[PDB]
Amino acid sequence: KETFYITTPIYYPSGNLHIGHAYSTVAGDVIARYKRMQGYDVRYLTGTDEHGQKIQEKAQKAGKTEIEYLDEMIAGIKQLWAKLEISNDDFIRTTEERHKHVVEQVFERLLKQGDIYLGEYEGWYSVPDETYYTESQLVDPGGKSPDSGHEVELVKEESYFFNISKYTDRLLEFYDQNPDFIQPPSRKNEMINNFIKPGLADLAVSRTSFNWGVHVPSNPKHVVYVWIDALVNYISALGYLSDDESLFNKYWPADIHLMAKEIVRFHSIIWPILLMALDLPLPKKVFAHGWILMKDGKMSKSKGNVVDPNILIDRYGLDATRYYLMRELPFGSDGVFTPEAFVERTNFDLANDLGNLVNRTISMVNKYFDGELPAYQGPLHELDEEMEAMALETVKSYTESMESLQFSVALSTVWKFISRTNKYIDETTPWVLAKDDSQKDMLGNVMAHLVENIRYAAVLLRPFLTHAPKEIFEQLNINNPQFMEFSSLEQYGVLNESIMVTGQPKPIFP
Numbered sequence: 366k367e368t369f370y371i372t373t374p375i376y377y378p379s380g381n382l383h384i385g386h387a388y389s390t391v392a393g394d395v396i397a398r399y400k401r402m403q404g405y406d407v408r409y410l411t412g413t414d415e416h417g418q419k420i421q422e423k424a425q426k427a428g429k430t431e432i433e434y435l436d437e438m439i440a441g442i443k444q445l446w447a448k449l450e451i452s453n454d455d456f457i458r459t460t461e462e463r464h465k466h467v468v469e470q471v472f473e474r475l476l477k478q479g480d481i482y483l484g485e486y487e488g489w490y491s492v493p494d495e496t497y498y499t500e501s502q503l504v505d506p507g508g509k510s511p512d513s514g515h516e517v518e519l520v521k522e523e524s525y526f527f528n529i530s531k532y533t534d535r536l537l538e539f540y541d542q543n544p545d546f547i548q549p550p551s552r553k554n555e556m557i558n559n560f561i562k563p564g565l566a567d568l569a570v571s572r573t574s575f576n577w578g579v580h581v582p583s584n585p586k587h588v589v590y591v592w593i594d595a596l597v598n599y600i601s602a603l604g605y606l607s608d609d610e611s612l613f614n615k616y617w618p619a620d621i622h623l624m625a626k627e628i629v630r631f632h633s634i635i636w637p638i639l640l641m642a643l644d645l646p647l648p649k650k651v652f653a654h655g656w657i658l659m660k661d662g663k664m665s666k667s668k669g670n671v672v673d674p675n676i677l678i679d680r681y682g683l684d685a686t687r688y689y690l691m692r693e694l695p696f697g698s699d700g701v702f703t704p705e706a707f708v709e710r711t712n713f714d715l716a717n718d719l720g721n722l723v724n725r726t727i728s729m730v731n732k733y734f735d736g737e738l739p740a741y742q743g744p745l746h747e748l749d750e751e752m753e754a755m756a757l758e759t760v761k762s763y764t765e766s767m768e769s770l771q772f773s774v775a776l777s778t779v780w781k782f783i784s785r786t787n788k789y790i791d792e793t794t795p796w797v798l799a800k801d802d803s804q805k806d807m808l809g810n811v812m813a814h815l816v817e818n819i820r821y822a823a824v825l826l827r828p829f830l831t832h833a834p835k836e837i838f839e840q841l842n843i844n845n846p847q848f849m850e851f852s853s854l855e856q857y858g859v860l861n862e863s864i865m866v867t868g869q870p871k872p873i874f875p
């Protein structure tokens with residue numbers, strides 16, 4: 366079987382994870398499940414970026430040691446992914462020796478090759494802006510930020526520097542060979558002012574001002590700078606430079622690195638250059654989504670302008686939480702959270718459109734045939750040929766949207782099919798057919814189309830929702846695992862033996 370490897374970013378446990386982090390991890394989970402259903406050998410990784418001054422500060426901020434603070438935070442994150450039913454195959458932590466050893470190895474290798482050299486970084490850090498500046502960029506100079514008005518802090522410390530400019534021609538050559546590397550196309554607007562043409566400055570890849578992180582074996586006063594440390598997670602979790610590299614050679618290069626837009630530059634410039642320096646294959650694709658916003662900007666874990674996903678899961682359930690994120694907030698833009706939109710998505714799309722349809726269909730199969738669904742014969746009603754064609758086009762359109770990670774467009778397309786199946790009841794009028802004994806076949810045909818239409822939706826929603834499709838298969842009494850796969854949607858009319866549906870149809874209530 367063909368392999369597929371997808372990653373989220375390793376999240377910085379500086380606070381509790383909000384719904385933006387949930388979107389990222391659910392989005393990657395949707396693809397993982399989707400790819401497993403297509404017949405790929407999938408590995409899906411997530412994790413925690415546990416080193417840095419920022420973690421060292423947040424442990425200070427919560428008046429506590431480094432490793433005690435983290436253990437408590439990592440427990441909460443694993444509990445969240447458990448509650449979200451994320452099908453991640455592994456959880457990488459940068460504090461683990463399996464990661465650390467590889468970072469140490471990589472860093473000493475770059476040292477041996479001459480790629481890195483000892484020096485001093487001198488610059489101007491704006492405390493509010495969280496961005497470094499040169500002295501010429503300062504306003505009223507020891508000066509003000511050009512972006513804001515806050516005066517800057519002078520930062521001088523020993524640092525290793527990585528000669529990245531020599532990989533410029535190979536990087537530009539890689540972009541030419543892989544013009545669709547960054548998806549969606551709007552996200553390579555993050556590559557504006559990239560400095561590749563005029564010349565990339567040597568990157569400061571270690572700190573001496575703090576001591577929390579991966580220490581450089583040659584010079585332990587230095588700690589490896591957080592971004593090269595963090596990016597190693599994608600290859601270290603597969604056992605790169607360990608005594609078993611079987612996962613690395615099976616899954617690398619990664620098919621998708623998933624993220625939000627603000628780390629496209631890091632994943633598109635620094636990460637391929639690092640891989641080039643190790644003579645490793647480059648990632649296939651970078652998929653970057655937008656931000657969930659509030660009323661004071663992007664949802665931020667250090668700021669606290671957040672919605673806790675535990676609140677949404679506890680109150681409304683898992684399916685409503687997962688559906689809302691994927692449907693309401695498109696991959697290719699930013700989006701505002703509101704409690705209004707959440708209940709509308711929950712009640713109108715899930716409980717009504719899908720939930721009514723299932724209840725209506727089972728109620729009529731119980732009423733007219735005593736639960737005994739007649740087998741699919743063919744498109745016997747005059748509308749069936751178009752509707753069966755629509756079902757096939759729904760799967761094809763769904764596929765196109767899913768391959769480009771347009772999750773809201775895929776779900777929107779699925780919901781047009783669900784709505785049309787509700788309208789199919791209205792315009793066929795089974796209750797009227799049921800009065801005439803001579804129309805029993807047509808009535809059977811109509812019920813058969815309703816059940817098959819529902820099965821199409823349920824299969825397509827398996828990557829998105831973990832409970833409701835399973836609940837739908839149980840009530841309709843589709844036990845065969847074959848009828849739950851994508852391949853069974855390739856031709857309409859799967860159920861050609863009669864089926865007994867449930868006698869006590871409960872609400873699906875997704």
Ligand SMILES: Nc1ncnc2c1ncn2[C@@H]1O[C@H](COP(=O)(O)OP(=O)(O)OP(=O)(O)O)[C@@H](O)[C@H]1O
Pocket residue numbers: 374375376377378379384385386388389623624625626627628655656657658663664665666667668
């Ligand atoms: N508002 C958001 N919308 C979507 N994704 C988000 C959001 N915030 C964080 N993420 C996800 O987390 C990744 C960034 O992880 P990070 O660890 O920095 O959390 P943070 O909230 O961005 O940081 P900070 O702690 O500085 O606010 C993004 O690339 C994205 O995957």
